[PDB]
Every structure is written in C-alpha cells, then in structure tokens.
C-alpha cells in the first residue's frame, strides 16, 4: 500500500535540512557521497528517507541507482529515478494535472511530483504536499514553469 501521511510528514521534517546535514543524518555511503560533493540535490534522497522510515523501504534490487546509508537501507539519488520509482511502486496517481497550480491540489495530502521546464539540474521535483504547501520548497505552485503535476494521496 502507501505510507501514512503523518508519518511521511514527520520523516521528511527529519531530513528537511541542507544536503550536508542530510549527509550527517543518514551517514554511510550517502554521507560519504555528500561529503565528497557528488550529491548536491537532496530531493530524491529525502524522499528515499521518507519511504525507508515509514515501512515502505526501497528494495536493494529496484532498477534504480541507489546508495546505502548507515542504516544499511537504500537511497535513490536522481530525481528522474525517484519519480519513476513512485510511478512503479505506488501505481497510478490519484490526480494528474497539466499546467498545475496550487488551487488544483487543495484539500489533498500526499506525495507530489511536478515536472516542468526552466531548471538546469533536473526535469522537476518530488516532495510532500499537505493540502496547501510542499514540505521542503514550497510555493512551487519564478523561473521554473510546471507543465505536469501528479499526486499520490497518503492516508
């Protein structure tokens, strides 16, 4: 099934910090790659932490690039991989919206994926959504232009 919304939001707050701090928190190969500067975008790593912390851990054999943490659990480090992973483990989203905006996602909570143009380091972002804001950053719904917004509701 799916992680509870409350647990997800709690977990995410634990890693809602600078990528360096995320490195200190998770440790192991995650921390090591962050220390070395190889990982700068904490987004998929934060989401990985969420899944691993709420009873829906990423399998060692999921066909996505993973790195272990000190907990010996696994952390995806590419946004595109994280998005595909959700698409393939959670199934099909509860809501899909072209040219998404905040009002489109009102009154619903869970995992949100926004793809669009204008970023030089990624095709989009994946984070938590509580009905009015994102868990990290934040008022995504300005250089980034969202083309597609996708939500998996968390119970």
């Amino acid at each position: 099934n799916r992680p509870s919304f409350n647990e997800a939001w709690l977990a995410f707050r634990k890693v809602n910090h600078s990528v360096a701090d995320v490195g200190s928190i998770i440790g192991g190969n995650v921390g090591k790659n962050i220390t070395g500067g190889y990982f700068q975008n904490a987004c998929p790593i934060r989401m990985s932490y969420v899944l691993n912390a709420t009873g829906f851990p990423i399998a060692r054999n999921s066909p996505y690039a993973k790195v272990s943490g000190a907990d010996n659990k696994f952390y995806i480090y590419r946004v595109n991989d994280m998005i595909d992973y959700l698409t393939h483990t959670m199934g099909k989203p509860d809501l899909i919206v072209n040219n998404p905006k905040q009002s489109d996602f009102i009154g619903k909570k869970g995992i949100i994926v926004v793809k669009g143009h204008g970023w030089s380091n990624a095709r989009g972002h994946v984070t938590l959504w509580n009905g009015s804001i994102c868990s990290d950053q934040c008022h995504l719904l300005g250089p980034f232009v969202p083309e597609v917004g996708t939500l998996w509701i968390l119970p």
């Binding site: 500067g37 700068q40 975008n41 690039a65 790195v67 590419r78 595109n80 030089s120 095709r123 250089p143």
Partner: protein, 100 residues
C-alpha cells in the same frame, strides 16, 4: 534554460569531469560550490552508477595535485583542469563504461 538535457551520456561524463576538477582546484567557496552544483546537474542526467564518478575523481586527483609554474604569477589551477580533460585514461574510462 541550459543545454543540460541535450548532452549525450559520454558528453555528460566529460562535462562532469571538467566541472568536478574545477571544484577540486579552486579555493574560493562560492566558485567551488558552483562547480559542484554544475557537476551534480550532469550526474542527474547520467545513467551510470556512482563508482564511475569516483573513478573520474581518482584521475582528476592526478591533475589537481600537480604544481604548475610560469614566468607570470599563478598556480595555473584552471589549466590543470584543461590538461585533465584531455587525459587518455579519462577518455578510455568513459568509452568502456558498462552503463551506456
């Protein structure tokens, strides 16, 4: 708005090598962070496992550790990166990558 999505896997790996080396040789925090961010962009669109970037770093470390001199005052760090991206082993490493 950058050309990040237009590079081939091979080009991404070369762009990564360059940016990463620049992150290694420069002292200033803002610049170093900038080069790191840039590198991370190229890693995002890669299909390769993280170890290949570690290996690229090994090779880069062979250049960033060099002492360069001239008849003008400089450490010539920039050119260490430029010589590095011409490295034959770097190129062979990228060409024989398992994850194409």
């Amino acid at each position: 708005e950058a050309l990040t999505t237009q590079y081939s896997q091979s080009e991404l790996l070369k762009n990564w090598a360059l940016s990463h080396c620049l992150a290694l040789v420069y002292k200033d925090d803002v610049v170093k962070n900038d080069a790191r961010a840039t590198a991370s962009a190229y890693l995002e669109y890669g299909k390769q496992s993280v170890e290949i970037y570690h290996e690229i770093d090994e090779i880069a470390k062979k250049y960033s550790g060099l002492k360069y001199n001239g008849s003008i005052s400089s450490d010539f760090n920039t050119m260490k990166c430029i010589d590095f991206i011409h490295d034959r082993e770097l190129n062979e490493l990228i060409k024989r990558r398992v994850e194409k």
